[PDB]
Ligand binder design. Structure first.
Ligand SMILES: Nc1ncnc2c1ncn2[C@@H]1O[C@H](COP(=O)(O)OP(=O)(O)OP(=O)(O)O)[C@@H](O)[C@H]1O
Ligand SMILES: Nc1ncnc2c1ncn2[C@@H]1O[C@H](COP(=O)(O)OP(=O)(O)OP(=O)(O)O)[C@@H](O)[C@H]1O
Ligand SMILES: [Mn+2]
Ligand SMILES: [Mn+2]
Ligand SMILES: [Mn+2]
Ligand SMILES: [Mn+2]
Ligand SMILES: [Zn+2]
Ligand SMILES: [Zn+2]
Lengths: 356, 348
DNA sequence: ATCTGTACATGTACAGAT
DNA sequence: ATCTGTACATGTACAGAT
DNA sequence: ATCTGTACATGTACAGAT
DNA sequence: ATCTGTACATGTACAGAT
């Protein structure tokens, strides 16, 4: 009931959705069309909407949209980057519009991203209907981010992705453990869909920096978010409603509110809570372990699970089991203990950060 | 325990499946070849396997197989025949055939008969044509008797006909998303090959949802994991097998049941699966009461003379027009007897 | 004349609104 | 409870191309 | 256009375990 | 008696090659 009111605060307004989507779809459509023009290296690129807004777990406002511009690259060979599981070099087999981004048969990611960014920047210049600019590049980001002032501020991440239709890389063989929850047929069908590669774009100074790509499963996460129950009728008009998405929203909002205040939490991002709850949904497969009447204890057990991931320094990528999002190389102990304490304080004092 | 032993009897043998299928697949691949490996009107026909063998509810022997040869036809107008729900006139390569079902079936049949004639490695012939059948039926002996029904079908990719809008009522069982996706698939038309002497009989086709029934049979739980390797077994298919066996055994003995077919049983269990959607209502420990509830539901269908097409609800398969009252009362008496005596007919 | 990539046309699950 | 805007899957029309 | 290759669903069969 | 793990078998979706 206390959490029932927070969700009411977090709920998007149709008026805002309508206003924001009108602008966003206009800008996205124009950019998609410019990539189809001339001898553009990105001709054939197709659009895939992803992220919280299209999973219906966007909270507070419709002010951030994620969209994949995906390009199918056939006849592709991958080299895993130093057994990390998630990062790859991409290589080609013949001697192609990606000609100008090739090196030693190796597809440069920062070369491709730069050209992609240059096209988007020029196209944005010739929009005089909407107040829209291109954000300064961020290290580690695979995206060209648009800032729309619709009056209201709106971010759009245009994510460049390679699309391979072959079978998924073996580092994912033990990932996606949905057998006891969504089952073997769903798992088999999901793994028949393409996989995606986005630029790592780390800028950190290490070898292969500009030629490292990162696996993306945004499309698989979108399907799961929207087909999340063991029962096919879960959250449908002739079935029972669960509180799975509501628990994600509350967890997202806790991290968002804390990150707004404490810049010690810069290492953390909402993908961490999204990954955590995919494990909770696998651990607790039954729709009855997510009854809306038990929202408080369902949110609590998610917090307890997240706190144990922070303390034990282990939050395995849901799709790549050997990739630890909470490794020391990515987040130091200090950052994790700080978040542990901040969460435990919220937990134990009525969630006062929900009232800010 | 009695029912478990019956199901052990009904179970097909790996060796039998392997010998029957490699011969059936030989013949079918060759007919499918001929259909487009010639300037025939059926160039572009594609194969779709259907029926109990491919749903894994075939019982006793692998001795009957069903195959659709389906052909895409663009821009066709349907016209419902006299409000029957299931039967239609088709209208606008094939212009040798208003699209007459009788005219198309016969050329299709003539092709198959010719290709069967030039098969020398398998003992195979074409059964005499049956009024009422949309099929060309092949008889194989290797030495086991095996019959194959080659079913000609038109494939339309528009919205399903209006008479189905109330059909397929899976919303509380498989859900709205499965229903919407199933209805995004094509719908099929097959010949109505009756000789009854009625008016438009020769150019009427009948709706087929064999493709949709296959998906259901193999995606039948309310839980996605039903009968999967990380899920629980249910006894839904076993119940269909048992009810199928009861009717097969009765039809063997009683000529009075010639009007009944396994599709009646299949239809009745689709309604029971919709009435009782929870997988726990089909627990394997409760096989007996599950079988009994199917019997009771089937008997209520007989008693009220009402068994609606699961996809076309106004089409009553138990109409007085199609099955006489005395047939239904005869079958009622025989089922009530088997029920009340421990199913003696299951022991022979 | 026919061919075809682009985009309209149709239908409905999701979830906010009343 | 019903009404309703957006997203999205798939079927089809046709301007401009061949 | 056609056809093989791959992966894993659905089954049956059976020994060893419970 | 049933359950579980491995072996053995066919069916079917679709990527990629030719
Ligand atoms: N570090 C990451 N590793 C893998 N995938 C990621 C990562 N960060 C983001 N993604 C993918 O990109 C999508 C968009 O990311 P984003 O940061 O906008 O979050 P979101 O899930 O849309 O939620 P919100 O925008 O409301 O914070 C995610 O849903 C996820 O699929
Ligand atoms: N009267 C009918 N109306 C509609 N569809 C039918 C009818 N009879 C058969 N079919 C379709 O054709 C398929 C093949 O029918 P068939 O008579 O071979 O039975 P079956 O379901 O395969 O089982 P079995 O052959 O083991 O009795 C059916 O499963 C169904 O999809
Ligand atoms: Mn986002
Ligand atoms: Mn983003
Ligand atoms: Mn059959
Ligand atoms: Mn048949
Ligand atoms: Zn749900
Ligand atoms: Zn089952």
């Amino acid at each position: 009931d206390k959490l029932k009111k927070v969700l009411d605060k977090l709920r998007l307004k149709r008026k805002d959705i309508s206003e924001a989507a009108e602008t966003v779809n206009k800008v996205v459509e124009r950019l998609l069309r410019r990539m189809q023009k001339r001898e553009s290296e990105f001709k054939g690129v197709e659009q895939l909407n992803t992220g919280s807004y299209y999973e219906h777990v966007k909270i507070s406002a419709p002010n951030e949209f994620d969209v994949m511009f995906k390009l199918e690259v056939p006849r592709i060979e991958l080299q895993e980057y130093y057994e990390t599981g998630a990062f790859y070099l991409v290589k080609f087999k013949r001697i192609n519009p990606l000609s100008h981004f090739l090196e030693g048969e190796v597809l440069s990611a920062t070369k491709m991203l730069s050209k992609f960014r240059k096209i988007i920047k020029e196209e944005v210049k010739e929009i005089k209907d909407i107040d829209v600019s291109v954000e300064k590049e961020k290290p580690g980001s695979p995206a060209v981010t648009l800032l729309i002032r619709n009056p209201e501020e709106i971010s759009v991440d245009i994510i460049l992705a390679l699309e391979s239709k072959g079978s998924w890389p073996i580092s994912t063989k033990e990932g996606l453990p949905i057998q006891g929850w969504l089952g073997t047929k769903v798992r088999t069908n999901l793994r028949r869909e393409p996989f995606y590669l986005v630029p790592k774009n780390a800028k950190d100074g290490n070898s292969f920096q500009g030629e490292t790509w990162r696996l993306s499963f945004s499309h698989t996460e979108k399907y799961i978010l929207n087909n999340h129950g063991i029962e096919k009728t879960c959250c449908e008009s002739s079935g029972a409603k669960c509180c799975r998405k509501e628990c994600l929203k509350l967890m997202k909002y806790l991290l968002e509110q804390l990150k707004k205040e404490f810049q010690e939490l810069d290492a953390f991002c909402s993908y961490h809570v999204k990954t955590a709850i995919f494990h909770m949904w696998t651990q607790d497969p039954q729709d009855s372990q997510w009854d809306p009447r038990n929202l408080s204890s369902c949110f609590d057990k998610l917090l307890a699970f997240f706190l144990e991931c922070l303390r034990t320094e282990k939050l395995d990528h849901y799709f790549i089991p050997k990739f630890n999002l909470f490794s020391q190389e990515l987040i130091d102990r200090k950052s994790k203990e700080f978040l542990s304490k901040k969460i435990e304080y919220e937990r134990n004092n009525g969630f006062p950060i929900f009232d800010k």
